[PDB]
Write a protein that binds this ligand. Structure first.
Ligand SMILES: CCC(=O)Nc1nc(C)cs1
Length: 171
């Protein structure tokens, strides 16, 4: 059985208990914390690609109102985000299982852009999600996994200074 675990959940949970925020920019900003995933149970000899996308956790616009994030009352449907390919892809199971799979090079943007960068909507809440795609073999297979601990709101600047302080403390 394929097992997927979040590395450094301790730390992600401190961010989550404050409501996490991630900066987006026109050129694209790397994430802190970085999503790092522990994977066991792959076929060491099989070929896999690791994909990352961001699910819109709800259909609302969020605003920081007197020190608290509060959703709007005008939901719209959220078009799915684009998919980031881990740059190690494609690779052997052995490769993926020998150390945490670290998405350190994904950049989050607010503007339709060349590529690589993943466009999010500012002030929407997102739940990171990976797809593990068995490639090249006879049977294509996909295993997906969400990381609730890693939820955040996309922001053009930090609103909650407690988030600002944690980001600096741990970076
Ligand atoms: C799952 C398919 C896959 O790995 N796609 C890739 N495309 C590029 C360009 C690198 S890996």
């Amino acid at each position: 059985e394929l097992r997927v675990g979040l590395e450094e959940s301790e730390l992600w949970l401190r961010f989550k208990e404050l409501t996490n925020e991630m900066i987006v920019t026109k050129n694209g900003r790397r994430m802190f914390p970085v999503l790092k995933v522990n994977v066991s149970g792959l076929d060491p000899n099989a070929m896999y690609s690791f994909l990352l996308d961001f699910v819109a956790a709800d259909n609302h616009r969020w605003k920081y109102v007197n020190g608290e994030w509060v959703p709007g009352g005008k939901p719209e449907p959220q078009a799915p985000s684009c998919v980031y390919i881990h740059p190690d892809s494609p690779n052997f199971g052995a490769h993926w299982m020998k150390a945490p799979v670290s998405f350190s090079k994904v950049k989050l943007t607010n503007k339709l852009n060349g590529g690589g960068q993943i466009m999010l909507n500012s002030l929407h809440k997102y739940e990171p999600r990976i797809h593990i795609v068995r490639v090249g073999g006879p049977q294509r297979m996909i295993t997906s996994h969400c990381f609730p601990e890693t939820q955040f709101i996309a922001v053009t600047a930090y609103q909650n200074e407690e988030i600002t302080a944690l980001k600096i403390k741990y970076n």
